[PDB]
Structure formats: C-alpha cells, structure tokens
From a paper:
BTN2A1 consists of extracellular domains (IgV and IgC), a transmembrane (TM) domain, a coiled-coil domain (JM), an intracellular B30.2 domain and a C-terminal tail. Although BTN2A1’s intracellular B30.2 domain shares around 50% sequence identity with BTN3A1’s intracellular B30.2 domain, our isothermal titration calorimetry (ITC) assays revealed that the BTN2A1 B30.2 domain does not bind to HMBPP, in contrast to the strong interaction between HMBPP and the BTN3A1 B30.2 domain. By contrast, no such basic pocket is evident in the corresponding region in the BTN2A1 B30.2 structure, explaining BTN2A1’s inability to bind to HMBPP. The monomeric BTN2A1 B30.2 can form a homodimer with another molecule through crystallographic symmetry, with the dimer interface burying an area of approximately 1,924 Å2. The extended C-terminal loop in each monomer contributes to the homodimer interface. Analysis using size-exclusion chromatography with multi-angle light scattering (SEC–MALS) confirmed that BTN2A1 B30.2 forms a homodimer in solution, and truncation of the C-terminal tail blocked homodimer formation.
Vγ9Vδ2 T cells—a major subtype of human circulating γδ T cells—respond to multiple cancers and infectious diseases in an MHC-independent manner; they are specifically activated by small, non-peptidic diphosphate metabolites called pAgs. The sensing of pAgs in target cells requires a surface protein, BTN3A112–17, that has both intracellular and extracellular domains. Here we show how—in both humans and alpaca—multiple pAgs function as ‘molecular glues’ to promote heteromeric association between the intracellular domains of BTN3A1 and the structurally similar butyrophilin BTN2A1. The BTN3A1–pAg complex functions as a composite interface that directly binds to BTN2A1, bridged by the pAg molecule at the centre of the interface.
Numbering used by the authors:
A (entry chain A), B (entry chain A): 323 to 521, 526 to 534
Write the structure that this text describes.
Amino acid sequence: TFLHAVDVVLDPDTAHPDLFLSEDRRSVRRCPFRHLGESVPDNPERFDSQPCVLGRESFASGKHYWEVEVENVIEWTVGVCRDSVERKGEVLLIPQNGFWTLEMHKGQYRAVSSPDRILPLKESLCRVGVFLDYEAGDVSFYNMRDRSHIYTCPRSAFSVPVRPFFRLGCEDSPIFICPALTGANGVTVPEEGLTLHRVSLLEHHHHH
Amino acid sequence: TFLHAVDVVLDPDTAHPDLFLSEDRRSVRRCPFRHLGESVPDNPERFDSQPCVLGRESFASGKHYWEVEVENVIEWTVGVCRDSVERKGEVLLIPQNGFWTLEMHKGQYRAVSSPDRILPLKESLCRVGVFLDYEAGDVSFYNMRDRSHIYTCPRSAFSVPVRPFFRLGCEDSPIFICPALTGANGVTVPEEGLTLHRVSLLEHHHHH
Ligand SMILES: [Zn+2]
Ligand SMILES: [Zn+2]
C-alpha cells in the first residue's frame, strides 16, 4: 500500500571513472579532468564506457520514488535498471537490456532513450520524479513542478532487484539527487521552533 | 528509516458543516450555502465552529509526509493534530492544545497559528509539504517548489496518534491534498508506454 520516498545515495564502485561524486554521494557531474583517487580503474561493477552510476539501494518489491534536479544539464538520463545489467562497453540503455529510462538528448526528451519516442513536453524539466511499482511492472516519470505524469514504460517482469540509474551525457554539469525529507533530524530545535533551516558541486572546478 | 509518502483522504465525519468535500474526499472548500446532505449536524467527531477537517489516517510511529496545494486560497491552515483534540467551540489551534500548524492569515504566514511568529517568506506558497517524525517529536513544513524547509515546531511528546489537520479560513477557495504518486496504477499501458497521463472543485458553484 505505502509509497516509499527513497533516500538515494550513489554507489561509487559503479560510477564511470570520469564521474565525480560529491562527498555525500548525492550529486554527480562528469569532469573532463582526473582527480587522483584510490579507486579501482575497472572492477566488474563499474561502467567503463557509458557515463553511468547506480544508487546503492536495490528494490525487489513495493512502491518507491525519488526526485532528481536536472536544471542546467543538457544531456542526462534517469530511471531504474536491473542489478544484473551489463556494465562494459557501449551498452544499449533499453528495456530489453534491463534499463527503464527518461533521457534529455539534443534539446528533446526521449522515452526509454529511444529516438522514436520523443515526448512532447511544453516546458524545460527542472526536477524529475522516478517512480517504481515493482509488482505492477511499472517505471514511471513525473514532472515534480506540478506532480504531472510524463511517461510509464511498457510493463515489465523485473524478475531481479532493480536500482536507481543515472547517466551524465555532458561535462561540468551536476545533477542533484534530492534527499528524502528529514524535518529537523539531528538539528537542535529552539524553544520557538526552527525557522527556514538551510544545510556544492556547483563550486567544483579545474581553474585553481 | 523509511519515509512514507502518505496518501491522505479526508474524514467527512470530522468536517465542519460549511465544508464541501470533493466526491473523492481529496479536496475541500468552505461554501457559503448548504448542500442537502445525509450528514449528522453535530456528532462528537465533528468540528462545530472552527472550519476544520481531519485526514482519515492516524500515525502512532514513523516518518510520514504529504503535500497540499493552496494557490488562490487567502486563509488556510495545514498541519497535524492529536486524534484526541477538542472539536467544539472556538478551539485555540496551538501546540498546548494538540495542534501543530502553519497558517496563511491576512497575507502573512504564521508558525503554529501565532500572531507572534510571522515567517519571513519571500514568495507566495503554492504547494506545502507537511512532515511528521513521530518519535523525534517533529512536525515540519516545506515549500515544495524547491523542497526548502519553512518551519519545525518545538519538539513535542505526541503521546497519542496524530492525524492530518486542515482549516479553511475563507470561502469559495478549495485546497487540494495531493494524492500519493501511483504511476500507471489501474491504467492499461500501451505497447509503446503511456504518455502524459491526465485523470474538480474548481467548477463547483451556486449560480445554476
Ligand atoms: Zn573535477
Ligand atoms: Zn457549495
């Protein structure tokens, strides 16, 4: 019955080597330059060619959703994939291969990353909802400005656990995976209440 | 751990008699005129003076949130209350009486319905999130345009179950309680997917 508002954190062991994750692993950009790191170049979990990264959490049942900020990113993909998807080479990001996606490519939105399913959106998307109903075989996408439906993929027998999926098709342009709401978690609330609480990859550059 | 994105439906047995609920009990307005109905004028669950209505579901544990559309409503209150709150006469809608609220009154937003806690918001709110962390004693409010925090009430020992709470301080102006996202639930998904799916109290009037 209950819809889970997921708290998505990225899995750095899946991330293509050109992706730079925030310290909190909740935002990611593709950087043109290398950061000297501790990370294995080509462990089997890692996407080696497609500039992709997965959420750490997998879902095997139930209803789940999360939201992604994509303003100022010209090329991106969001959605869900099987935990078993192929990671190596020029993987086709299509349902038949275990990927259920929404893409921005060359100023258009494409259902299931298909040049034959251009979605006739009438505004630039800024915050996209990704929705999963596992048993119903449903991956759906929402415009979170007005909570309006964008697309539901053809219904699928997922069979294995699925994970949040992300692709960055352009450089120097971060996406932000919106944390689940937490209220005042961890924060002292004064006797009159806590007002307008505020707690970035936007400042990451290579011109130091 | 998990945040519940609640699907809130109103309880008509709590609603002040001047409130008119949509057929699906997910939106409400205060109407100046009577609708000939089947409803008891003054059952003990019903607010008799404060123009208020509760959600049907109560929460005794965990983290929960829901969202409310309030555009074009000049006077409204949203929040959480104890299931045990007083229903009769001119109840003071304050924490000490079991009400944790955010109010729009006379062009200002007021924390806990207090004329002494005017919130310095810099935009007109359109969609408000109401958040509960029961064990942490937390009722929080969010601006869902950008998922920004507005206010957390002083932390409270709720003790008994709590319910969604709504007040309509003006006439002919509906609030819409946003349904939990459902993807394509109940809807046939064509072989190419389902595109831009669309499924009102805005048309309710007394000039027939
Ligand atoms: Zn960099
Ligand atoms: Zn009416």
